[PDB]
Motif scaffolding. Structure first.
Motif, PDB file in Angstrom:
ATOM      1  N   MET A   1      -2.665   3.755   3.520  1.00 28.57           N
ATOM      2  CA  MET A   1      -2.819   4.200   4.603  1.00 28.57           C
ATOM      3  C   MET A   1      -4.188   3.394   5.862  1.00 28.57           C
ATOM      4  O   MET A   1      -4.344   2.489   6.172  1.00 28.57           O
ATOM      5  CB  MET A   1      -4.183   4.983   3.589  1.00 28.57           C
ATOM      6  CG  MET A   1      -3.531   6.384   3.071  1.00 28.57           C
ATOM      7  SD  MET A   1      -4.300   7.723   2.107  1.00 28.57           S
ATOM      8  CE  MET A   1      -3.255   6.898   0.945  1.00 28.57           C
ATOM      9  N   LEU A   2      -4.363   5.070   6.620  1.00 29.70           N
ATOM     10  CA  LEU A   2      -5.231   3.959   7.725  1.00 29.70           C
ATOM     11  C   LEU A   2      -6.620   4.138   7.512  1.00 29.70           C
ATOM     12  O   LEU A   2      -7.092   5.179   6.871  1.00 29.70           O
ATOM     13  CB  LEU A   2      -4.369   4.642   9.097  1.00 29.70           C
ATOM     14  CG  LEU A   2      -5.787   4.346  10.007  1.00 29.70           C
ATOM     15  CD1 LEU A   2      -6.101   2.977  10.520  1.00 29.70           C
ATOM     16  CD2 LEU A   2      -4.924   5.221  11.412  1.00 29.70           C
ATOM     17  N   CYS A  30      -1.370  -0.296  11.351  1.00 36.72           N
ATOM     18  CA  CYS A  30      -2.695  -0.731  10.849  1.00 36.72           C
ATOM     19  C   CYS A  30      -2.458  -1.487   9.364  1.00 36.72           C
ATOM     20  O   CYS A  30      -0.981  -1.371   8.858  1.00 36.72           O
ATOM     21  CB  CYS A  30      -3.467   0.442  10.046  1.00 36.72           C
ATOM     22  SG  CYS A  30      -2.742   1.328   8.765  1.00 36.72           S
ATOM     23  N   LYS A  31      -2.920  -2.711   9.363  1.00 35.94           N
ATOM     24  CA  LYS A  31      -2.101  -3.497   7.736  1.00 35.94           C
ATOM     25  C   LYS A  31      -3.864  -4.038   7.469  1.00 35.94           C
ATOM     26  O   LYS A  31      -4.417  -3.788   7.835  1.00 35.94           O
ATOM     27  CB  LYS A  31      -1.162  -4.441   7.952  1.00 35.94           C
ATOM     28  CG  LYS A  31      -1.463  -5.651   9.622  1.00 35.94           C
ATOM     29  CD  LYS A  31      -0.065  -5.646  10.220  1.00 35.94           C
ATOM     30  CE  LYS A  31       0.330  -5.854  11.489  1.00 35.94           C
ATOM     31  NZ  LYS A  31      -1.657  -6.878  12.487  1.00 35.94           N
ATOM     32  N   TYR A  60     -12.903  -1.184   6.648  1.00 33.78           N
ATOM     33  CA  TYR A  60     -11.704  -1.205   7.137  1.00 33.78           C
ATOM     34  C   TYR A  60     -10.501  -1.268   5.747  1.00 33.78           C
ATOM     35  O   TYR A  60     -11.731  -2.550   5.067  1.00 33.78           O
ATOM     36  CB  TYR A  60     -11.367  -2.263   7.784  1.00 33.78           C
ATOM     37  CG  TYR A  60     -10.092  -2.476   8.590  1.00 33.78           C
ATOM     38  CD1 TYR A  60      -9.062  -1.702   9.149  1.00 33.78           C
ATOM     39  CD2 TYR A  60      -9.097  -3.336   7.311  1.00 33.78           C
ATOM     40  CE1 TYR A  60      -8.350  -1.470   9.879  1.00 33.78           C
ATOM     41  CE2 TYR A  60      -7.819  -3.043   7.978  1.00 33.78           C
ATOM     42  CZ  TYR A  60      -7.576  -2.293   8.465  1.00 33.78           C
ATOM     43  OH  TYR A  60      -5.643  -2.331   9.344  1.00 33.78           O
ATOM     44  N   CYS A  62      -7.375  -0.755   3.943  1.00 32.79           N
ATOM     45  CA  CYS A  62      -5.386  -1.163   3.926  1.00 32.79           C
ATOM     46  C   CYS A  62      -5.250  -1.160   2.655  1.00 32.79           C
ATOM     47  O   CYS A  62      -5.112  -3.023   2.495  1.00 32.79           O
ATOM     48  CB  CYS A  62      -5.013  -1.709   4.995  1.00 32.79           C
ATOM     49  SG  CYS A  62      -3.810  -1.727   5.510  1.00 32.79           S
ATOM     50  N   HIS A  64      -1.995  -0.163   2.269  1.00 31.84           N
ATOM     51  CA  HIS A  64      -0.582  -0.093   2.787  1.00 31.84           C
ATOM     52  C   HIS A  64      -0.230   0.345   3.776  1.00 31.84           C
ATOM     53  O   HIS A  64      -0.991   1.225   4.390  1.00 31.84           O
ATOM     54  CB  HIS A  64      -0.255   1.067   1.887  1.00 31.84           C
ATOM     55  CG  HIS A  64       1.193   1.884   2.120  1.00 31.84           C
ATOM     56  ND1 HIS A  64       1.995   2.317   1.231  1.00 31.84           N
ATOM     57  CD2 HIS A  64       1.531   2.052   3.391  1.00 31.84           C
ATOM     58  CE1 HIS A  64       3.255   2.910   1.272  1.00 31.84           C
ATOM     59  NE2 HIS A  64       2.810   2.568   3.054  1.00 31.84           N
ATOM     60  N   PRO A  65      -0.051  -0.459   4.840  1.00 33.48           N
ATOM     61  CA  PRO A  65       0.399  -0.624   6.483  1.00 33.48           C
ATOM     62  C   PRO A  65       0.612   0.737   7.389  1.00 33.48           C
ATOM     63  O   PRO A  65       2.122   1.744   6.329  1.00 33.48           O
ATOM     64  CB  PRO A  65       1.126  -1.455   6.897  1.00 33.48           C
ATOM     65  CG  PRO A  65       1.128  -2.680   5.542  1.00 33.48           C
ATOM     66  CD  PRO A  65       1.233  -1.894   4.005  1.00 33.48           C
ATOM     67  N   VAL A  66       0.501   1.326   7.849  1.00 38.47           N
ATOM     68  CA  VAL A  66       0.960   2.924   7.924  1.00 38.47           C
ATOM     69  C   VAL A  66       1.078   1.929   9.582  1.00 38.47           C
ATOM     70  O   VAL A  66       0.587   1.848  10.968  1.00 38.47           O
ATOM     71  CB  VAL A  66       0.139   3.932   8.150  1.00 38.47           C
ATOM     72  CG1 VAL A  66       0.379   5.132   8.459  1.00 38.47           C
ATOM     73  CG2 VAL A  66      -0.745   3.501   7.321  1.00 38.47           C
TER      74      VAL A  66
HETATM   75 HG   LIG Z   1      -3.293  -0.015   6.873  1.00 37.83          HG
END
Ligand SMILES: [Hg+2]
Ligand SMILES: [Hg+2]
Ligand SMILES: [Hg+2]
Ligand SMILES: [Hg+2]
Ligand SMILES: [Hg+2]
Ligand SMILES: [Hg+2]
Lengths: 258, 258, 258
Positions: A1-2, A30-31, A60, A62, A64-66
């Motif tokens: 998620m971001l 995002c990652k 920040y 993360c 799971h990249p989005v």
């Molecule tokens: Hg992310």
């Protein structure tokens, strides 16, 4: 998620100011190690590439990249609510149809929240940066802006020529010709005003003034600008951020190529 | 006759700035207890109503009320001679064909005097203000301006919703949706920043963003803005003056009604 | 040859700002006692005449006068590189096809140099200044600008009327009429704010507001403006420089003549 929270909404607003006008669509991702974003103009002569590391944020998360694409104009339209001092949090689920921008003041008081519609863009990030460039130079970005603003009036093309210890910007058009010549120098009275130059090979490239004008906007993000030129690839103009950078890759004019 | 002298031409200039753009014709009437003025836009969704008591002036004399109508544009064209610090005197006989604006500097030095042509408007002042409104709230006008300026970008309609202890502004259009949620609070560190709310009944009305944008101009006249809403009548946005007030009554959109 | 170095590029930039817009072609001539320049608008109602003595420069060398004509627009386009604090040197050979503008910062660092293409203009400098004018007056130029900016809104013609100890500016058009009346006065608290008037004969002339608006630009060169009027010739508005002056000669309207 971001889930990325900027201490000051101002940083994000200036970053987006950099993509502004010169590109229409931006692809963010995002990652675990931060956020990157790329945007290419329609003629494909300019690539705007961003990198913001985890440390540039106040918070920040993360797992799971989005990847998300959006219209730049829509984003900037919404990017004037930050009060600059407001806190900004970018939020999105793993399969988003929108991106949430959440601006909040220190106190619980006022909360401006936006839900921006996303565009579907085929993920295809470019990796055109070179190992070595013919020449590399950095100088105050306000100085670079003035140099570009001077010459722009004279022509739609501004030539950058580099020889040992010499950097020369030139424009030549209808009303006449102009040139700005700068020399490398170390100012200890404050080195943020120095002009460095490392030349492995003399270079001489021409760029479309309209594009250099788009690029100078980065001055608002950094005191200095790095310019890397090569006869083999697009030129790189870079504006460093605290943990990150905004890069502009511009293809030289072939004879007529921006 | 009309004889009203403002200490600072600036006050009158800001007042007229409020009628500016959103209305074309204004009907003024001076009398024993002061000056009032009303202007309605062409679509009849906005009424701008002014009241300046005798005490707001440095000198005011009235032994015979005078009603006079004029073109707002003509008036503002002339309303940039006040130097802000200049003294301004409005003058007119009992059966005027013109209105005289007299700006003078402290010393006898420079005297700018104007004679503005009047328009004949059927005297018909409206008295649409309500005894009680469903909900009443006040907040800093600069805050209200920001709220309006945010949402405006998203839609031509901005909805105001009120529930117990909650005020919510919302806009939803093409690029997405946005909302600003504020909560009542007393700031003793300076109560001009507090946000008051008295709700007798939850309200939910929609207004045309173009009109709210015209209304925010009143920020220049007062630190706070009062907003009174009702499901039975036009909403009232009010900006208090020292002895007086500038009021904007705006009809809610029916579904499509500004 | 031409070799004139201005201490601050700013002085030259403000001087050119004065020719700006109201004229297209300017004819410069450097000589042993300085530089002069003349420009006449297309309708021939306005003449802009400059004189800069040798002492206004940090360095001036002339062993052979040179006359050169150029497009004003091209010149101003290039006249925003001075950083104001930059040093500016005007350079040209005895039979030039171009004029070189050389801006340099104190240190060797940055050198912006321009080569402006010249236009061939039949040398024909006018000498229309009078020995005596009907009336002469000077007042702060910012005050004159305000007076012009006020009245301009009302009409395309602004009348200047002079009688013993009285100067009156008047405009009368569609929305109504306006007037600014000023009286001579000596302010010892600072005489740069005084208003002098020497009247040999009452005068009453009308000028096109569009032209007076062009003329007020000279405020940026001098604190005071001198106005000389005559019923026999164009009016003279003059802005003094340290060793020099910028003059605007404007033909009165015949009834319809700018
Ligand atoms: Hg992310
Ligand atoms: Hg840009
Ligand atoms: Hg009255
Ligand atoms: Hg308005
Ligand atoms: Hg010369
Ligand atoms: Hg001009």
């Amino acid at each position: 998620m971001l889930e990325a929270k900027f201490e000051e909404a101002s940083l994000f607003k200036r970053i987006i100011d950099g993509f502004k006008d010169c590109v229409q669509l931006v692809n963010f991702q995002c990652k675990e190690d931060g956020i990157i974003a790329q945007a290419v103009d329609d003629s494909r002569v300019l690539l705007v590439s961003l990198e913001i590391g985890v440390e540039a944020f106040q918070e920040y998360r993360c797992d799971h990249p989005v990847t998300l694409g959006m219209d730049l104009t829509s984003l900037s339209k919404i990017l004037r609510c930050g009060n600059n001092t407001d806190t900004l949090t970018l939020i999105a689920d793993n399969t988003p149809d929108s991106i949430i921008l959440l601006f909040e003041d220190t106190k619980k008081d006022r909360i401006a929240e936006y839900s921006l519609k996303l565009m579907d863009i085929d993920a295809d990030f470019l990796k055109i940066e070179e190992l070595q460039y013919d020449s590399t130079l950095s100088l105050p970005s306000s100085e670079f802006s003035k140099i570009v603003r001077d010459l722009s009036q004279l022509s739609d093309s501004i030539n950058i020529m580099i020889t040992k210890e010499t950097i020369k910007f030139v424009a030549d058009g209808d009303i006449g010709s102009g040139s700005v010549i700068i020399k490398p120098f170390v100012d200890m009275e404050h080195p943020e005003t120095s002009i460095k130059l490392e030349m492995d090979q003399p270079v001489d490239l021409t760029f479309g003034a309209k594009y250099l004008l788009d690029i100078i906007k980065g001055s608002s993000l950094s005191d200095r600008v790095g310019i890397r030129l090569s006869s083999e690839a697009p030129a790189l103009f870079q504006f460093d951020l605290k943990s990150g950078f905004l890069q502009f890759f511009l293809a030289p004019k072939f004879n007529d190529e921006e």
